[PDB]
Amino acid sequence: MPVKLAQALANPLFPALDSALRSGRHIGLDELDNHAFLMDFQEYLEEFYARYNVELIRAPEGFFYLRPRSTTLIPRSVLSELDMMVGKILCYLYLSPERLANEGIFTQQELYDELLTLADEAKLLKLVNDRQKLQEKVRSSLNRLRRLGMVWFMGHDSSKFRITESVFRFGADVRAGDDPREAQRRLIREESQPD
């Protein structure tokens, strides 16, 4: 192994960040130490994690994550369909023109209201067996998406949260200067992966 790959593994930040990565957490800018850590050693941690048949991926929006190949040595898991939907609406909220002024801060109530109007009524209701049950499930997905590094809790509660640039993993594909919000709306209808 190279010398500064050893300097990375020797850093007091690595065991906490290595575990977070292996659990599927996305490391955005808001974790400056961990983010700057992966910036200076990106070339070396890529080789290290490549030995687990996973790829340390830096998305074009600056955030890091591990993406496992089919032959990963770290067991993989998937987000539920409701969790995928909530993340997709979290990114619609991130695409909103107020996001710069609000710093990505939204309420669980704002997420409820966008979720009911933006999502297809037929499919969303088949993700339960109502609406106050759907609230406690949305709160469950947001805790899962907080663990993955998609939101930060503003308080001890899921009621106020800041959305992270890592939410772009739930965003459709866009180019030129097309409005990504309509593309997001049509889209809305161990290693835990958001696929």
Place this chain on the structure above:
Amino acid sequence: MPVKLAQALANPLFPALDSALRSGRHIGLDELDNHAFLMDFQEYLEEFYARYNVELIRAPEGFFYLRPRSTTLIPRSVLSELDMMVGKILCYLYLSPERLANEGIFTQQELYDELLTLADEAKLLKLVNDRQKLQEKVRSSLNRLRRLGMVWFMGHDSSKFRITESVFRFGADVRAGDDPREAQRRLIREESQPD
């Protein structure tokens, strides 16, 4: 970091064994390369894994595993109550006087029959909502206990399996030359931990 801690992490065995360890798998004698690997570097891998607030523990019966402290950086999980019971009966089967001659090989049918006679009828039946349903749940626990390194599948099926010395983690405490089998019978009535 020390030089031969680097020789361990550089070994082509480490990423597969490191992942298996972090998932809670118990490394017994039957994995000779991985076992001999942890034998020659035990002093150095202890220090390495101690930085995740987990303890690389070698039980008195030769097998290795990671045991997380309350402040572990690797997320922890527990076995179900039925999985704990199946493992406890797997060790009762391991304590049997035929085990040396059979090399730890038992059938899923042998595990069913010992499970019904050895376990308390009132509690075991409250682990379902019958007996062919309990068979497919026993098969599920054995697949989980195989992942943890408690048994090896003799074939592509759970029908024939070899029990590992790591099963002693489900065994009661014994000293002098007392029969451990009666102590086992009274006992019968990310990091996944068998607690």
